[PDB]
Design a protein around this nucleic acid. Structure first.
Lengths: 141, 7, 48, 144, 144
RNA sequence: AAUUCCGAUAACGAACGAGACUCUGGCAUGCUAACUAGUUACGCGACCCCCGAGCGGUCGGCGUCCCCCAACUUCUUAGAGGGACAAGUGGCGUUCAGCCACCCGAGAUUGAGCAAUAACAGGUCUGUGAUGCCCUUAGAUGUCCGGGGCUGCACGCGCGCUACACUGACUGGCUCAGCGUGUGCCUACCCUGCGCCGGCAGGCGCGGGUAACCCGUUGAACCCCAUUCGUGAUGGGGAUCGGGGAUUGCAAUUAUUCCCCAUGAACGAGGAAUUCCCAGUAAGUGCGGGUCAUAAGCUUGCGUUGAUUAAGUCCCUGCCCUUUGUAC
């Protein structure tokens, strides 16, 4: 089975739990004192947002390769409400997930592409497929 | 007198 | 019909109001009766 | 039996929602971008997506396979583009390779249920015209 | 989720101001003029206090540590840019002012602007706009 | 919709204007041929289960313009042609024009440009080295520089944005877009990618694009899923104010704008009284281009979500036609 035939929400939650269990993803110094997005009015509600977002990011990188900082910021954009003024669109943040892609580099699941960006390594693809099979097995039973 | 219904 | 429903009579009463009407010509127009006619129009009669 | 190159490709549009179905003989897998037909993002409209499956025979969709690729559209538009894609992919395959008597009966059933499974809706976006925020509307104006 | 937790207080009178205990800890300490919503979140994260419990269930020791974080947040090596006032004009110390401290500092700045007779201070004394507003249709509520 | 058409008829031939014509979207498994695009396969690799399993399943990872290492255009668009003309059945109709139901049909009223003579004391002399006349002309109303305001502020008026909440808002995840501009004679000023630094606007090094080749498969927003708040002017509504920093240029105070912490007023759907809207319509909601050293709450358009109301009249306000009083 591939990652397509499993629930996307449960696959992300399972991968985030797996990263928490391993505990080897690189954690920046600014743990729970920064906002995930520019548009937000508050800090992230729940902890382990670093693991959950890294889980989703690895999934987006699986579907589409050769993605860099500019590609990621387009993806995770958020609905920026500016109160009295009409609301507009804001791209995702930059530095925090640079620690995520350095974390993935530390865990040896991303590799620099020939022209730019980061591409999935065999180690990362194998891990994503087995956890997908475990998710499917858990859903069935 | 606006043609609402259809002496 | 609203009066008929409350009416005691076995559908035997239908009063009619008949009133003679007289308008001079200055306000015949205002009433909208006797709207102005065409040049061949004038030579007409009752209307229908 | 093992007949090569027995594949037919169909296309459907619903407000620039181009859905292409590559139908051939197979085990009966229906995938969209390699993602299962049931495992689609609009789970609320999943019943609409599976309507050809529930209407026509599951044996027919097990003998044949469909692959859907979408480049354009929206969310309701894309679901209907895919839904009409598999319906006319089955119709095209049932036209070319199997008895046409069954092709007439499945087409009659599809028309009886809903004609939109086969027809592309002509209605498109209507260009805005100056003087008002919408295409038909007018910018509210007062004399004084 | 205890039914009737012991030592439950409907209100708390810390920092001379009441905090609505029936609301959560991350959102009841916000009645302090120096503590808002985002700042309340980050200090609770530093104090590793669960957000499910309300303000009426925290123990006295937990409340005291929260107050200490309020008074001297820069001691815990929190980011400097997160502070209320940074790089004070009168002193080089970086610190956050809470409740009456924020009002006292603001009035000290306002009387300072009146003494210097600057453009911002003059319009503050006159009760007018500063940030490029259009008093042609701005200020139509609070001024007769 | 239409002196369009049909008929009694002193009108017949016509002509102007509707119409007709032109612009964009609706289609064949039709044609031409498009590596500046895709599809199916081909020989690979990465994997997933598993015996070495299977014509297994995904790849926007490789190439099928120095190549035999294959073709084609269904989907991406650019040239030409019919198809929709009230054509076919039924009903109404002076059996005529015309109106409606219906089957086959991509669609049974798809939206827009031009649009007869003429009337405006309609507005523009601040659109041109188009201009009549008058006006200050060397203490110019020119040209040159600098600063200030064009925004000021007690009050009323137009279009508009934000919301007054629970169908809600917050946090995290998931899935889709096209019109279209993008390095300039004088004119310096373009779109941006990749990688690093920074909490954020932002900064640094390395490149592609004069363009279906790069942004960009334009991973946009309510929308689909999970948690929290639960009728409390309550994390929502965020007006006004302080501090810190980069942004653009010479310059931001009389804050271009943006990023973080802050104070956090009204706003329980609002009396009269009006406006716009009939199908991809209204409306939500965004995003392009016009503006630009930097920019939108304006404007034109492009989208995604996207329903009921009616197929009627002149009751209120106005236009058209005739009969037409009228020293006009």
């Amino acid at each position: 089975v591939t990652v397509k035939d499993v629930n996307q929400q449960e696959f992300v939650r399972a991968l985030a739990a797996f990263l928490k269990k391993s505990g080897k993803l690189k954690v920046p110094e600014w743990v729970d004192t920064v906002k995930l997005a520019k548009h937000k009015e508050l800090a992230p509600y729940d902890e382990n947002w670093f693991y959950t977002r890294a889980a989703s990011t690895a999934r987006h990188l699986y579907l589409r390769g050769g993605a860099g900082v500019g590609s990621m910021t387009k993806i995770y954009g958020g609905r920026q409400r500016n109160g009295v003024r009409p609301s507009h669109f804001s791209r995702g943040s930059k530095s925090v997930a640079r620690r995520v892609l350095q974390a993935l580099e530390g865990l040896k699941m991303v590799e620099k592409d020939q022209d730019g960006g980061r591409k999935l390594t065999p180690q990362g693809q194998r891990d994503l497929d087995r956890i997908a099979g475990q998710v499917a097995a858990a859903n069935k039973k | 007198s606006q043609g609402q219904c259809t002496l | 019909r609203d009066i008929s429903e409350a009416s005691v009579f076995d559908a035997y009463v239908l009063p009619k109001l008949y009133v003679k009407l007289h308008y001079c010509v200055s306000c015949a127009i205002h009433s909208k009766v006797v709207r102005n006619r065409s040049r061949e129009a004038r030579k007409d009669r009752t209307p229908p | 039996s093992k007949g090569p190159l027995q594949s037919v490709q169909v296309f459907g549009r619903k407000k620039t929602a181009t859905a292409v179905a590559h139908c051939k003989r197979g085990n009966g897998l229906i995938k969209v971008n390699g993602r299962p037909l049931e495992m689609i993002e609009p789970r609320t409209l999943q019943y609409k997506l599976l309507e050809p499956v529930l209407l026509l025979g599951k044996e027919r969709f097990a003998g044949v396979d469909i692959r859907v690729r979408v480049k354009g559209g929206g969310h309701v538009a894309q679901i209907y583009a895919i839904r009409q894609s598999i319906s006319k992919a089955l119709v095209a395959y049932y036209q070319k390779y199997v008895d046409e008597a069954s092709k007439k009966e499945i087409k009659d059933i599809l028309i009886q249920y809903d004609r939109t499974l086969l027809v592309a809706d002509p209605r498109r976006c209507e260009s805005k015209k100056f003087g008002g925020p919408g295409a038909r509307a007018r910018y509210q104006k007062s004399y004084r | 989720s205890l039914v009737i937790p012991e030592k439950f207080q409907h209100i708390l009178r810390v920092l001379n101001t009441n905090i609505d205990g029936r609301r959560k800890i991350a959102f009841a300490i916000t009645a302090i003029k120096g503590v808002g919503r985002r700042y309340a979140h980050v200090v609770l994260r530093k104090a590793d206090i669960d957000l499910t419990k309300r303000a009426g269930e925290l123990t006295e020791d937990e409340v005291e540590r929260v107050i200490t974080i309020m008074q001297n947040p820069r001691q815990y090596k929190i980011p400097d840019w997160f502070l209320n006032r940074q790089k004070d004009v009168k002193d080089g110390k970086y610190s956050q002012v809470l409740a009456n401290g924020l009002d006292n500092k603001l009035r000290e700045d306002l009387e300072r602007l009146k003494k210097i007779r600057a453009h911002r201070g003059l319009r503050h004394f006159w009760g007018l706009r500063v940030r490029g507003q259009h008093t042609k249709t701005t200020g139509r509520r609070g001024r007769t």
